[PDB]
Amino acid sequence: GLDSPTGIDFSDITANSFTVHWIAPRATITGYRIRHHPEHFSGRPREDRVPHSRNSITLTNLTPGTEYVVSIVALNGREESPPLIGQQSTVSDVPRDLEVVAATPTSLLISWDAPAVTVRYYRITYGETGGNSPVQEFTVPGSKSTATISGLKPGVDYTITVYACRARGDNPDCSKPISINYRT
Ligand SMILES: [Ca+2]
């Protein structure tokens, strides 16, 4: 059988990419086949054919906060090696630890922790839990991870959600949201 590559390693990890490295087998090879998929995904992995002279690839268009399974197979014409497998997560872009830090009868001060990415702005939404009531939205600058919500009703359950939004492409790229409930 054809010996596998060895020494899988990862570098330059971001929310949407990372670089994968490996060491060629002590064998004749004609190329590599690299596959990657989010863990537990039941469908087809993404695939790249890499030249035999190469020992790394940067994988892009990845989803934040996700562990990927990466498989590298050496090829020698018809033959394939068993795969060299590694698991690496991308950085999460989702805020953490959303909480109400203070309350008055009609206002809530909320606070959270920034994700480890460059946030352009946060979007805050809030509405009465279970109300036919309008959901309301506003933003805060990405440099600040607190907000004050005003104009609320006392004695009412509210759902409050925060998104971290980055501004890189055709649309802002906003994280999955984090939510809490709080009764004024
Ligand atoms: Ca896992």
Curated annotation (Swiss-Prot):
Subcellular location: Secreted, Extracellular space, Extracellular matrix; Secreted
PTM comment, free text: Sulfated. Forms covalent cross-links mediated by a transglutaminase, such as F13A or TGM2, between a glutamine and the epsilon-amino group of a lysine residue, forming homopolymers and heteropolymers (e.g. fibrinogen-fibronectin, collagen-fibronectin heteropolymers).
Record region (Cell-attachment): 1-184
Cell attachment site, short sequence motif: residues: 168-170
Tissues and organs where the protein is expressed, per its UniProt entry: Expressed in the inner limiting membrane and around blood vessels in the retina (at protein level). Plasma FN (soluble dimeric form) is secreted by hepatocytes. Cellular FN (dimeric or cross-linked multimeric forms), made by fibroblasts, epithelial and other cell types, is deposited as fibrils in the extracellular matrix. Ugl-Y1, Ugl-Y2 and Ugl-Y3 are found in urine.
Subunit relationships: Mostly heterodimers or multimers of alternatively spliced variants, connected by 2 disulfide bonds near the carboxyl ends; to a lesser extent homodimers. Interacts with FBLN1, AMBP, TNR, LGALS3BP and COL13A1. Interacts with FBLN7. Interacts with COMP. Interacts (via type III repeats 9-14) with TNFAIP6 (via CUB domain); this interaction enhances fibronectin fibril assembly. TNFAIP6 may act as a bridging molecule between FN1 and THBS1. Interacts with TNR; the interaction inhibits cell adhesion and neurite outgrowth. Interacts with FST3 and MYOC. Interacts with SVEP1.
The protein, known as: Fibronectin
Species for this entry: Homo sapiens (Human)
UniProt gene name: FN1
